[PDB]
Enzyme design. Structure first.
Site, PDB file in Angstrom:
ATOM      1  N   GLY B 163      15.542  57.318 -16.154  1.00  0.00           N
ATOM      2  CA  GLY B 163      14.157  57.464 -16.787  1.00  0.00           C
ATOM      3  C   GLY B 163      13.830  56.756 -17.984  1.00  0.00           C
ATOM      4  O   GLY B 163      12.514  56.887 -18.475  1.00  0.00           O
ATOM      5  N   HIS B 181       4.668  66.253 -25.850  1.00  0.00           N
ATOM      6  CA  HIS B 181       5.961  65.618 -26.428  1.00  0.00           C
ATOM      7  C   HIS B 181       5.691  64.204 -26.939  1.00  0.00           C
ATOM      8  O   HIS B 181       4.502  63.561 -26.642  1.00  0.00           O
ATOM      9  CB  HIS B 181       6.949  65.598 -25.203  1.00  0.00           C
ATOM     10  CG  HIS B 181       6.497  64.754 -24.079  1.00  0.00           C
ATOM     11  ND1 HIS B 181       5.469  64.858 -23.341  1.00  0.00           N
ATOM     12  CD2 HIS B 181       7.344  63.537 -23.624  1.00  0.00           C
ATOM     13  CE1 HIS B 181       5.362  64.024 -22.452  1.00  0.00           C
ATOM     14  NE2 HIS B 181       6.597  63.183 -22.570  1.00  0.00           N
TER      15      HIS B 181
HETATM   16 NI    NI Z   1       6.728  61.143 -21.743  1.00  0.00          NI
END
Ligand code: NI
Ligand SMILES: [Cl-]
Ligand SMILES: [Cl-]
Ligand code: NI
Ligand SMILES: [Zn+2]
Ligand SMILES: [Zn+2]
Lengths: 340, 340
Positions: B163, B181
């Site tokens: 990812g 985030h």
């Molecule tokens: Ni993200």
């Protein structure tokens, strides 16, 4: 006897207490089992353990955090596994400012708070810990060796089932919960609160269990779709206000340190801890249970779940019906009121 | 340029789109990066894949259920792992009556509903699925091969980080959430919504990130105690109403099928899915990021977490400062406004 199906409390003498089996029968002879749940405060002469001073080093391998979602008295509880901690570590958190018991007056005020706040601030519960706090010398009501006919499951199949025919310890903290359920195979249970703050319980008479099952299925039809015995997942919480509303009869009782609770076959119970504490439980059986066990509706939907073979109990204790039951033809009806 | 730090949207021509790197620089030259987040709608000539008809058989190995607890706009989100399911299975549930998108008028009404109901009815999110939906012939904006300097992490250390320098797919459903985030190592990200219903986003300008960090620490001091970068756990949800209240500047944008979003170093974002959908994302780097990466405050508190070595990027792209940085003496200050 016990027309109203209220939760009874009993104060055995030491002489009565030394015979477990007989005393369970006695309280059933008084209709204790109609309420589903009874309290037994033991004789003062008796003590499971000298002191609880040497257990901060004890290891809770799989505390779990209790996440609960829902509203107006219906909820579902999901258990997130957390890492190994010690009772010492558990105690610090339980006693910490974020997790500790609110200030309150009557239990009625603390109960309002449990239901207004169960979805907030998920607590840790040091549940299902294999082990016992009883010293080995202790012969009465020793949860690690009651010597009931449940012992036939082990003696005949070499089978161990953690927390069912062995003891489990439960370290609690404010607002940790146990959801509506009956025991594995609708067996009896025994729970002893070794120390700390109370554990409050709710019970529904076995003669009204099907009405609670029915209501649960209403409110959680999807869960009811994929399992028949979904309440056995121990995820479902229902408020006493909901129970009055749909006219399910139930009673409440608070257990304090040094007290036993007994649950009876097909007695639905639930409740919660008031603050830091330590209970010890296991399951047991009597001859009266056998029918309940032959007729217990199990969880289909997981392969983990507890299936006890009834063959040995019917063979020995219902010989007249063995062949009949073996052939699908035993059509006994359970009367939940009988002390049998 | 972009004084107000609003989220910009861009409509590249095919000619502009064929050069990824240059186009990212262009949008930075327009101050896109000040908002933290930008939309790029691609040229109509371009298509990542012919059709999405052949993917019901695709397997989501680790769907997770999103349990969220809290109140008046502050929440924490816990992920319960569920068993393997197919997109087919995922789609049925997403579209089912219990989980599907409510009826609504404006997005303002659907947004009110997300925040009034995020704690109820936990949804499944088919997150973090390794793989890509791009056909191999596709050379522009191909998330599986952007060819940015992030490729030096793999070329020099044989390292794969799922990812981060490989693609992930995200199958969503109504009310699945991504928490506040910034990216791993404060890298850039790219997200493409292959099909289905929208994904709404919230962003805070990198020049105000520290003010959001500060507010988060206020509201979650315990989490702040045990990790410095606790927001990196991706568990924390904060309402736009809370952000106005504590005067954190932020903007919102809705991404629809066929649109890209780019996040920029140290751009805090969060949001949610409107209904069944499928996005694909990865991280990438530019030379401007290098400073952000040298200065990124990491999660201390777990050993899983993503640490990229900056040595190779400083060695090649900041040779003038290499020895200095090596010796603890590089004291560059980041200006978040510069298009560098
Ligand atoms: Ni993200
Ligand atoms: Cl349901
Ligand atoms: Cl906290
Ligand atoms: Ni139980
Ligand atoms: Zn089941
Ligand atoms: Zn951390």
């Amino acid at each position: 006897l016990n027309p109203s199906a209220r939760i009874m409390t009993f104060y055995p003498t030491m002489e009565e207490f030394r015979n477990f089996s007989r005393y369970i029968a006695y309280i059933e002879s008084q209709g204790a089992h109609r309420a589903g749940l009874a309290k037994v405060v033991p004789p003062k002469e008796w003590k499971p353990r000298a002191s609880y001073d040497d257990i901060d080093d004890l290891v809770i391998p799989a505390p779990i955090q209790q996440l609960v979602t829902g509203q107006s008295g219906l909820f579902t509880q999901y258990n997130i596994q957390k890492k190994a901690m010690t009772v010492r570590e558990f105690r610090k958190i339980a006693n910490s400012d974020k997790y500790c018991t609110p200030r309150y007056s009557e239990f009625e005020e603390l109960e309002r708070k449990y239901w207004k706040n169960l979805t907030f601030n998920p607590p840790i519960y040091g549940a299902d810990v294999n082990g016992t706090l009883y010293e080995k010398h202790v012969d009465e009501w020793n949860i690690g060796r009651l010597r009931t006919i449940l012992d036939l499951v082990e003696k005949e199949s070499g089978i161990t089932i953690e927390g069912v025919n062995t003891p489990y310890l439960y370290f609690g903290m404010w607002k940790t919960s146990f959801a509506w359920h009956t025991e594995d195979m609708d067996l009896y249970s025994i729970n002893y609160l070794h120390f700390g703050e109370p554990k409050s319980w709710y019970s529904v008479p076995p003669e009204h269990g099907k009405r609670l099952e029915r209501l649960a299925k209403g409110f959680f039809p999807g869960s009811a779709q994929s399992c028949e015995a979904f309440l056995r997942h121990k995820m479902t919480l229902i408020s006493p206000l909901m129970l009055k509303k749909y006219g399910i009869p139930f009673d409440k009782v608070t257990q304090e340190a040094g007290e036993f609770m007994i649950t009876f076959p097909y007695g639905y119970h639930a409740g919660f801890n008031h603050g830091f504490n330590c209970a010890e439980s296991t399951n047991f059986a009597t001859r009266r249970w056998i029918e309940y066990g032959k007729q217990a509706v199990l969880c289909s939907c997981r392969k983990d779940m507890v299936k006890i073979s009834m063959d040995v109990f019917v063979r020995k204790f219902q010989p007249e019906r063995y062949k009949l039951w073996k052939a699908g033809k035993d059509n006994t009806v359970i009367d939940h009121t009988l002390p049998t």
